[PDB]
């Protein structure tokens, strides 16, 4: 009772020191030092391909490791794996629970995993000797809707759900070898680092945390946003990440600086961001929106450079190929466009 | 290039077989209607069901396959996983009217569903599920609606009321006041695309499914008239 106030009194005071440490480490804005670089211009982005086989909204997709095969999850019980070059669908995986909210493609190109509101992160095996596609594991240890999951290895799937916690599953036996706690609200999206040694998670409390896959405890906390956190992804360098909230304001954070770098906001937009991803060089920040069309944000100037279109419903997912050759976006219109 | 030619030709046969299966399931998917169910903890949502996170209940009424499911596993927060139900035919909102204290909380939830950006085009079928307890409370007179709803002192039975035989006027005034409290919420922001269908039902009613089939039909029919520039 009384001991809580003294700890709270000291916790606030040392929290101010962190603010002072951040203030002392705040020399000048990134925008001021970067004003002397040449702008990218106006990127002419066109619908090079269209993929139409889904019966309802597409909620997420994940580009394969070969930058050719992509997998899309639509709320119909169908997990369809397309061939981007030839428009063919290699497999049409029938799910058990129709309401799927996430999907992932193995970096080895053998396993595909999905699972949404059913609280189960099913994992499907592709290359089988039986000639069919079956389920390899049924990871069921969460209490709350399962929002996003990205593989780390062929046995190291990392899952983030709606129970304010993230888990590092083990496909071999199916038990959670680590469970990360510390968030206060729903955790929506997470991105793994290029070296896969530490990842981040965006939560529905205007805060992003830095997790460690092996040690298993929170490392850094980032809170400068206004509302929920719908999407998040690392800078390709692996030492930075930018996230999009539901207040129509993308922000870019730097791990070493432990601050907020840029505020990707426009005085007109009032529609929140639903997906963020980078290009192969990190210059182009392609952020989806609720205003029915995407955007291309110059990551080093915070000035919009090019606006995409072609979707008659909101865009929810936006993935970039491994080689950076093309970007594919899926929308709630059941239309998975491939854009180069 | 013979080996290469056998690859893309194999994909076309693979694509043709898959596309045939997909079209077979396309017709089935369009022939089943989804109905999100949500209400209060003691409202009695499972009571209407008289046929994990999601409990599915499929019933076939008048040769039309319905698909009604309840979401119970997830926590109290619902501002993120409710956007997943914007493609359903209707939303079955069952709420109890016996507990007056837990009625204003339900009013905010219905208002929150009504004025939602992605749920603004979803008709809400309203159910009241504890009429037996509602009649007993007002007839007993120990608990007054006035202390929780001061606007009930100046309310009269509407001219369109259809009270059941052998029913006290006090019950009828209480029944329709709550209904007119929900309807005032819906009609204040009804843009003509989504509607409310208030209903009264106790826990022993037998035709709790026909009242949805006779209302999902009206909702879809009103959708076709509006999309033909005809309504």
């Amino acid at each position: 009772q009384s001991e809580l106030d003294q700890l709270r009194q000291e916790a606030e005071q040392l929290k101010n020191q962190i603010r002072d440490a951040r203030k002392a480490c705040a020399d000048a804005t990134l925008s001021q030092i970067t004003n002397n670089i040449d702008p990218v211009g106006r990127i002419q982005m066109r619908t090079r391909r269209t993929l139409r086989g889904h019966l309802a909204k597409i909620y997420a997709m994940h580009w394969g490791t070969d930058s050719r095969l992509l997998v899309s999850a639509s709320q119909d019980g169908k997990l369809i794996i397309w061939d981007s070059y030839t428009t063919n669908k290699v497999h049409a995986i029938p799910l058990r629970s129709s309401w799927v909210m996430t999907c992932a493609y193995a970096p080895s190109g053998n396993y595909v995993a999905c699972g949404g509101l059913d609280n189960i992160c099913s994992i499907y095996n592709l290359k089988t000797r039986e000639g069919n596609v079956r389920v390899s594991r049924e990871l069921a240890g969460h209490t709350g809707y399962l929002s996003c999951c990205r593989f780390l290895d062929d046995n190291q799937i990392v899952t983030s759900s709606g129970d304010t916690t993230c888990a590092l599953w083990d496909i071999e036996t199916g038990q959670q070898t680590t469970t990360f706690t510390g968030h206060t609200g729903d955790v929506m999206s997470l991105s793994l680092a290029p070296d896969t040694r530490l990842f981040v998670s965006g939560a529905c409390d205007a805060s992003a945390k830095l997790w460690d896959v092996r040690e298993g405890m929170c490392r850094q906390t980032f809170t400068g946003h206004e509302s929920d956190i719908n999407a998040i992804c690392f800078f390709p360098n692996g030492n930075a990440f930018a996230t999009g909230s539901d207040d129509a304001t993308c922000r870019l954070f730097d791990l070493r600086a432990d601050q907020e770098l840029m505020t990707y906001s426009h005085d007109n937009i009032i529609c929140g961001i639903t997906s963020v991803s980078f290009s192969k060089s990190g210059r182009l920040l392609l952020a989806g929106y609720d205003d029915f069309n995407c955007n291309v944000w110059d990551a080093l100037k915070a000035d919009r450079a090019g606006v995409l279109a072609g979707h008659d419903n909101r865009v929810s997912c936006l993935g970039v190929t491994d080689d950076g050759m093309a970007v594919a976006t899926g929308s709630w219109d059941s239309f998975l466009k491939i854009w180069n | 290039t013979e080996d290469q030619r056998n690859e893309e030709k194999a994909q076309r046969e693979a694509n043709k077989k898959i596309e045939k299966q997909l079209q077979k399931d396309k017709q089935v998917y369009r022939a089943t209607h989804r109905l999100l169910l949500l209400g209060a903890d003691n409202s009695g949502k499972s009571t209407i069901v008289k046929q994990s996170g999601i409990f599915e209940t499929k019933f076939q009424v008048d040769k039309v396959n319905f698909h009604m499911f309840d979401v119970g596993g997830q926590r109290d927060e619902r501002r993120k996983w409710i956007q997943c139900f914007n493609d359903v035919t209707a939303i079955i909102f069952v709420v109890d009217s016996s507990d007056y204290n837990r009625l204003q909380e339900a009013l905010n939830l219905f208002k929150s569903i009504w004025n939602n950006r992605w749920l603004r085009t979803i008709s809400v079928i309203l159910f009241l599920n504890k009429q037996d307890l509602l009649a007993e409370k007002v007839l007993a007179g120990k608990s007054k609606i006035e202390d929780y709803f001061p606007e009930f002192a100046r309310y009269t039975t509407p001219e369109d009321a259809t009270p059941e035989p052998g029913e006290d006027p006090r019950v009828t005034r209480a029944k329709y006041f709550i209904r007119d409290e929900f309807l005032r919420i819906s009609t204040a922001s009804g843009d003509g695309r989504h509607y409310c269908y208030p209903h009264f039902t106790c826990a022993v009613d037998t035709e709790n499914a026909r009242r949805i089939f006779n209302d999902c039909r009206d909702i879809i029919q009103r959708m076709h008239l509006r999309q033909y520039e005809l309504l």
Epitope: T164, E226 | N115
Partner: nanobody
Framework: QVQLQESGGGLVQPGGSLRLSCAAS????????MNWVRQAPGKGLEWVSD????????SYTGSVKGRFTISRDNAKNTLYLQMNSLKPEDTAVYYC?????????????????????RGQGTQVTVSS
């Protein structure tokens, strides 16, 4: 970081007056439909009143209707709730809840057990 610090009152005899000051910072105050929620001891969370972005649309719960005045000052980034004619059933803790998303007519999932954009709360008790 969004913070909602509150400065209210304590023990007051029934029929008295109290004023609740809700100091807010860290967010654009003008775009958010703040609410007011209370939790009586041994009871759940219940909603009291809400006020729109500009202060035009105001609603109240039935029990607290006709006794409480809610007003916001978008210039100084603060919210007010002035109460008169207290009742023994007003003994509760008050939270100056915010709204999850800007520019939304419906403020959804605000009385949840675990919520993020909600203040610590202050204790308001009436007795002799």
């Amino acid at each position: 970081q969004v913070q909602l610090q509150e400065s209210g009152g304590g023990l007051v005899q029934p029929g008295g007056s109290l004023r609740l000051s809700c100091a807010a910072s860290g967010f654009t105050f003008s775009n958010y439909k703040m609410n007011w929620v209370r939790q009586a001891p041994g009871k759940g969370l219940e909603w009291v009143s809400d006020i729109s972005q500009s202060g035009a649309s105001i609603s109240y719960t039935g029990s607290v209707k006709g006794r409480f005045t809610i007003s916001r000052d978008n210039a100084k980034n603060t919210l007010y709730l002035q109460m008169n004619s207290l009742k023994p059933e007003d003994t509760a803790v008050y939270y100056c809840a915010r709204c999850p998303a800007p520019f939304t007519r419906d403020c959804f999932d605000v009385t949840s057990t675990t919520y993020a954009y909600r203040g610590q709360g202050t204790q308001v008790t009436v007795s002799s």
